[PDB]
Write an enzyme that holds these catalytic residues in place. Sequence first.
Site, PDB file in Angstrom:
ATOM      1  N   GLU C  52       0.827  -1.209   0.000  1.00 43.18           N
ATOM      2  CA  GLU C  52       0.000   0.000   0.000  1.00 43.18           C
ATOM      3  C   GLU C  52       0.864   1.264   0.000  1.00 43.18           C
ATOM      4  O   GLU C  52       0.849   2.062   0.940  1.00 43.18           O
ATOM      5  CB  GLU C  52      -0.974   0.006   1.182  1.00 43.18           C
ATOM      6  CG  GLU C  52      -2.094  -1.008   1.086  1.00 43.18           C
ATOM      7  CD  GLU C  52      -3.159  -0.783   2.137  1.00 43.18           C
ATOM      8  OE1 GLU C  52      -4.147  -0.075   1.845  1.00 43.18           O
ATOM      9  OE2 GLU C  52      -2.999  -1.296   3.262  1.00 43.18           O
ATOM     10  N   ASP C  53       1.620   1.432  -1.088  1.00 42.35           N
ATOM     11  CA  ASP C  53       2.436   2.626  -1.312  1.00 42.35           C
ATOM     12  C   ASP C  53       3.417   2.879  -0.170  1.00 42.35           C
ATOM     13  O   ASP C  53       3.754   4.027   0.129  1.00 42.35           O
ATOM     14  CB  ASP C  53       1.559   3.861  -1.543  1.00 42.35           C
ATOM     15  CG  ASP C  53       0.617   3.695  -2.721  1.00 42.35           C
ATOM     16  OD1 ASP C  53       1.045   3.135  -3.751  1.00 42.35           O
ATOM     17  OD2 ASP C  53      -0.552   4.123  -2.614  1.00 42.35           O
ATOM     18  N   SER C  54       3.877   1.814   0.480  1.00 45.46           N
ATOM     19  CA  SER C  54       4.853   1.937   1.552  1.00 45.46           C
ATOM     20  C   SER C  54       6.262   1.746   1.005  1.00 45.46           C
ATOM     21  O   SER C  54       6.481   1.010   0.038  1.00 45.46           O
ATOM     22  CB  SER C  54       4.579   0.920   2.660  1.00 45.46           C
ATOM     23  OG  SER C  54       3.277   1.084   3.194  1.00 45.46           O
TER      24      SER C  54
END
Lengths: 203, 112, 439, 54, 232, 45, 262, 65, 83, 335
Positions: C52-54
Amino acid sequence: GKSAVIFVERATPATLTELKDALSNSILSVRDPWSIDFRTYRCSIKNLPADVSKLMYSITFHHHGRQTVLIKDNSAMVTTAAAADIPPALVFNGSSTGVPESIDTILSSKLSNIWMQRQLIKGDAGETLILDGLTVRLVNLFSSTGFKGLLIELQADEAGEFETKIAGIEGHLAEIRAKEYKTSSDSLNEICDLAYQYVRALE
Amino acid sequence: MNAPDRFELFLLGEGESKLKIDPDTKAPNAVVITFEKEDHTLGNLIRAELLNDRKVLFAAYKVEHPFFARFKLRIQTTEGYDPKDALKNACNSIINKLGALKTNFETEWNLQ
Amino acid sequence: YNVRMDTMANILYYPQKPLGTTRAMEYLKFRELPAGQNAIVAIACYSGYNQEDSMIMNQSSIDRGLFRSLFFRSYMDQEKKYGMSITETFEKPQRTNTLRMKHGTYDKLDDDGLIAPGVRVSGEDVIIGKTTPISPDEEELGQRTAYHSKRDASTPLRSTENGIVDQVLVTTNQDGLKFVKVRVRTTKIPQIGDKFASRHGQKGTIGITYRREDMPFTAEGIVPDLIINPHAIPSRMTVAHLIECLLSKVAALSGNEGDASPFTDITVEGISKLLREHGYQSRGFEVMYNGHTGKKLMAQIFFGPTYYQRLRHMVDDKIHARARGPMQVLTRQPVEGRSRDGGLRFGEMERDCMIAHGAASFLKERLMEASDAFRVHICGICGLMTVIAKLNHNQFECKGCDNKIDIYQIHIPYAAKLLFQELMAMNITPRLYTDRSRD
Amino acid sequence: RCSFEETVEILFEAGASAELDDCRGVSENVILGQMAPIGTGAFDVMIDEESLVK
Amino acid sequence: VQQLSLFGSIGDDGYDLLISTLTTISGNPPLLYNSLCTVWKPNPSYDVENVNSRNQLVEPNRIKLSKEVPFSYLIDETMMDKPLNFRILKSFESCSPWSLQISDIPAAGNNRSVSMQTIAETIILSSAGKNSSVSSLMNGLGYVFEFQYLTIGVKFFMKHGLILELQKIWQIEEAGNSQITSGGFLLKAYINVSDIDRINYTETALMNLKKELQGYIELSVPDRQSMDSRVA
Amino acid sequence: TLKYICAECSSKLSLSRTDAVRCKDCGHRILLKARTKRLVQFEAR
Amino acid sequence: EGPQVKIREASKDNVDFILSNVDLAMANSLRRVMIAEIPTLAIDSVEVETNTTVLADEFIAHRLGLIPLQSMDIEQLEYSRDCFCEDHCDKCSVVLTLQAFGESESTTNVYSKDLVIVSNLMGRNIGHPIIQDKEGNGVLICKLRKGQELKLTCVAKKGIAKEHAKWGPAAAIEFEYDPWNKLKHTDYWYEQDSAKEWPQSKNCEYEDPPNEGDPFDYKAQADTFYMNVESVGSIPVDQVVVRGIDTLQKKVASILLALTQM
Amino acid sequence: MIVPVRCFSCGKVVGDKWESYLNLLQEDELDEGTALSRLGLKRYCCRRMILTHVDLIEKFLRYNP
Amino acid sequence: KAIPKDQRATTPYMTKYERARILGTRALQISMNAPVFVDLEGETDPLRIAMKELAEKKIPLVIRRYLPDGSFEDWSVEELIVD
Amino acid sequence: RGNLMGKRVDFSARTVISGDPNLELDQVGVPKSIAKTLTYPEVVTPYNIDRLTQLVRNGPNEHPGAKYVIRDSGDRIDLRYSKRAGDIQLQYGWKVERHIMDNDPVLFNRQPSLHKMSMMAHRVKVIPYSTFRLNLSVTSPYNADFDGDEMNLHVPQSEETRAELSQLCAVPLQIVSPQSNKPCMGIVQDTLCGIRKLTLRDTFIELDQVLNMLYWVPDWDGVIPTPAIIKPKPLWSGKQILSVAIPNGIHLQRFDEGTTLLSPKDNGMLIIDGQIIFGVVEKKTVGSSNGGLIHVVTREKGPQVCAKLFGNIQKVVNFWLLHNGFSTGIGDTIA
Ligand SMILES: [Mg+2]
Ligand SMILES: [Zn+2]
Ligand SMILES: [Zn+2]
Ligand SMILES: [Zn+2]
Ligand SMILES: [Zn+2]
């Protein structure tokens, strides 16, 4: 009695076994283990006279009366934390409640603003080897940074021959390739001179 | 802000020890040893030597959380044998192989 | 910026020009004043901390000064004179004669009431000491008849801030009033909660930070400074993010900055050939090894440098918690704003969710004890709050209806009491009855 | 009714026509700040002294 | 250590009546005893910030060292050839093992029944070295001699750890010894407790003692400010 | 008195109180406060 | 018997060798210890007296923190927490200082060699700025013009890379094993053919292809490692490898000693 | 700015290669890749440092203190 | 007006709301030093003790279920079938 | 609207949320500063008189401490400036306010919050740094993404509302939403992409890694299953090591187009007694589908073991994925 403490800085955790095996030809009997603590404090006052030590030593002997000797400026102070070591004259008159405690707790709780605990050395799992008139105790020193060094305690009840015994101990230290060590056997009470040997041996 | 100090990654805390031997009841003759202030560097190297032995039935390790320097080492040997002895043989084997690696490395370095 | 007093400044330590540059940047002075740094980036699903866009950032790269920036906060204070009789004066307030003095420390102030530059300051520290003259027969509140002198009105630093005072200057303004401007600098090391963006719409915060021995590495020995989640690419359909990484790798190997203009004749096959001429894989993949076990990964990782930028959004200016703080003067409710130590808003939709769960006790506690709870007395005949309560001797009345016996006690929120009092001010009677007369 | 949109008009008509509220509605119990008849609070809990000797 | 005490005061005439009363109640004769207490206050020449290393406020408190001493150093020339009992009170290298104690302010609470006080205690066995005197030791710790008082009285041994101290207190100075309890004897009834049940049970013992002695001698609760040894 | 520095010419003024805010020798009213003369400790981390 | 080391390249900075007969755990443990668990000397505290530079103070302190130093006889220098003194003493740290002032109209450059040693070493060989430039000039710390002074005192303390990345003596460590893919640890991705896209590595010269048409491999283990160690400039490569092996040996021996006491 | 010390990955010292780098560029008129090949850099992690550096201290020194 | 026991026509099963408020009020009383009717197995948390009393129906409470017409019923938690 | 229906309230914290696979489904990682700022008033009882006494003797500076005491008279004494007095002994009937420790359920919310699932209780796990850590199986009912999104955390101040909040609001008690009679939470992102590659027929894992995979399970019985291939070399399949994470006593079957008892295309799904026979786990098996695996375990083994299912599956699939490796290059779009 006579005592002498020899501290080996350049030592290994396995050096106690080497020195223990070196004395196998003279070990007569092994007694119960022993434990000792060594706390080094620093004065927090901002106004002290000329020529004065800025540190306060504290040596806690385990099962030697559960005692604690404070050393500062070549002065000693025998304290205790066990209720069985309190004289009945202090309890009968009401001067003692009956439940004492360690002086380091007061110095770290009530008097922490004046004396702060700087250095801490915990020495457990000792060995009490009895030789021919000499009681040598072996213990390893461990601090918060890991292994510290080797501590040698020499206690003999014979007031005559004593230099030959410590000389032989230093010889066995030279046979195990344990170079660079401090030999302390000065004096200022046997526990006060012994604690002074700990201070002069660990500083 | 709130991140722990860096030197806490390898320094042992107060009131703690290096190894925590805790018996396990999931299988007979099984023990879980907790390692403090270490990571996979020691866990995998110990686990490999534990797997090279024939007296060890099960041997594994894991890091519970990366924010804490600790890992669990679960060992399970056969009946009549203690896992502590297998760990001692593993440590002795590692020390011997590292000593031979140092002696051979210096001997080969003196020829350059 | 060294000779200016701008408010809220952020100057990066090591600004770096990109590799895949556009010609228009030459006309925009971007190569002379870049707003980001090129960071080695790998695109993989490592330890699951990238989902998640980490992003996972190398700790050793952070310790060597990667994306570290400076923040300059300017506090401007000014003394004023109302009718010439009252004159504010910059001075060091004494704790003996000064009333309304803040609990902050005043040891960092000088004789003129200012902090010299270079002094390390933290939150709740007074930077500029200013006192206002008062009159003895004007307030006389608490101990004002004992302090006699003046009232404190200094401007301290923010509660959550800290740093080193950079520059302090004093000057008279237009009408000749002596004002003083302060500028404090603070290095903000990239934390986990800090946000980062790129040049393709990709934005996201850091998931976790690992060290070199904990990061995957290639056969050559280059460690990625930032790893992102593959699942970003297909959904967002940003193919340019991969082309900039490939062309940035070819530009980093050949030593010539690649042209990243929109409408040109540069294709992907040509960049694949130019990268193939340098020995690496033409498709950007590279064999990576695990950091924990040192074992080769089954799938090759897209590995290469990419230009990134650091946004203004940071966690140190967002995290805040309130547990019993100051209330407003109007509604006596928790204030609004992080600087004023304000609480979060429990809006209408939240209450509707609490009703959806069926928890009425948590709703009552959240709307009473957690916010504001008031106790009032109403009369039996008329349900209005005219009951004068003098309970120091246990005495009650209600004016206008002849009652001194039947007085009821109710716990209502202060906002509801404001509603009832506004209705009474609007000629509306909100009569309250504890008994059911309709039945 | 006044909570949703037009507060002042509904309140004025209420006071004008001498309207009475039952005060078992959701928003009403919310405004007054005490327990409402929803879920856990839709029933009262009692004690039976004859059950304490069990 | 939590000591629960109830104090009182009598005159020089009812001493035999109180000794006979407590002798008939406790069933044991009184035991004559004495104790010297020296108080060390912080050195005024030294100045230290009243704060620990954890940024916490510290309240300065006095340190009291108490010990014992035989009556051979207390009986003069006009006191010889007298019975060694309770009737005497009516006629008025290294260091010794001292008793180091610090008393705190008693607990709050209106309409309290007892007077609970927290006191820390450590036993000073001996010392050695150059500055082996206890005064030089206190000067090394950071305290100087403020005052001292010698108290001589009788004590009883009842049940549940109750002590009745009927003592007189004198101030030992160079210009002269002034009697603080001039005109009567100071009475005490304290129990040393190392749990809530044991504390409340001790309070029950003290309330039973006050109820049993009700009518004769009254045992009230002293003020907290009268037992606060903090330096201000 | 406290040491002050001029804006443009950077001269040492060291003017006291009740002397307004103005440089001597030039009319630049911007007066610097100068840095503290005590040491400041920093960490390389 | 045990491992064997065959050095291929030996220079002042890069040294490539072959470490074989070692289970993957001891090789990975070796490179992890060499990267992390090795002591180093770096600047820990920076005391700035006067600073007129256009750069920030903590920025200059960061750059000074990144500067490497000599760290040979660091074994007999105790840690800061281990010594019982207050602050520091000639047993824990090394005191350095820097004074720079612009002279002529041309800008003066502040180099790492401008640091002088004002503290006693007691026979040690640490504190000397490592100079690896061909012109004889140290690391360019900052530039100064006429009228700007820079006087500071740094306290170089001992530490490992786990505390901060400035204590990193080793650099890029080239780790490789199994040149010709026969252990089946990586499935190469190919668009048309894996032999025409993926090039051959250097270490392939020291072995041979497994030959097509041969039985599958499943009983062969991972061995014959290719390890290239690169030192920045603090300690030579032999002290990196030897100090790393002695570090892992002291850790394993510390675990054995931790198990013996139980 | 003003020559980043060490590198942001490998860790090799590069600060002592700037003066030579420019010296090789302004004297020998070589390309960027050739000069980086003469300095000893063999990995692009270092190459992005010298190649993408924007020295702004020169524009900062032109201000009078 | 209190429906008799022979006319109670509500669900004999204890709902999640009734179990929730019974465990909450019972745990609140246990936290306020209430006489516990079950022998403890070494618990310290009051909610676990309340669930221990609910598992054996030793909770001395009775529910007054309000009917929409204004009436109510008295269903003791001991006779209510839990789960 | 701003004073009756809604209002700004105390006992709350707002910050950026981020993921953490090592945590459980219902937990939430709370920073230490937030744990020391917010508080909770506990009642002094003989069961925790020693623990609360320790919290008083620790001080507000330390995390295992307290902040304020409330005597039975209804009066609050602050722990600050109370150390100047000396000793503070607690009695029965007082209320000491402690810091937020572990196992403390607090409400978690994210605006605008249009679901009843958008506000759910959670178990506090104290972790450093400053971001709220949570599992990624809860970001789907919140409709959130780890890109600067802030969330709100409310703390109950009473035991009654805490128990009523724990028995009515819980993540295991909200797996199957009543909206569309299907589970709202499932395996998303890299775990779902990794479990597919794990459940492939070509996926084989060696012993040394299988041991660590089985030990990464928190509720593993300790019985190593018989490998799928014995001699030459013991090899375990992905469905075998993944079947351990699935609790025993679960039966499921799903047939699609072209699915047969042999299934040459490896379609459908079959699980008997918690053992995967055939079928590749994907969106239509472990995801948020109607007739999914989570919907079967949720109604079979209840919501507790189903809450452990997310942890076991995520730990096994993530542990296999960090060693397996996955990426995405430009060759995926080359024709
Ligand atoms: Mg968002
Ligand atoms: Zn009325
Ligand atoms: Zn001028
Ligand atoms: Zn030192
Ligand atoms: Zn590099």
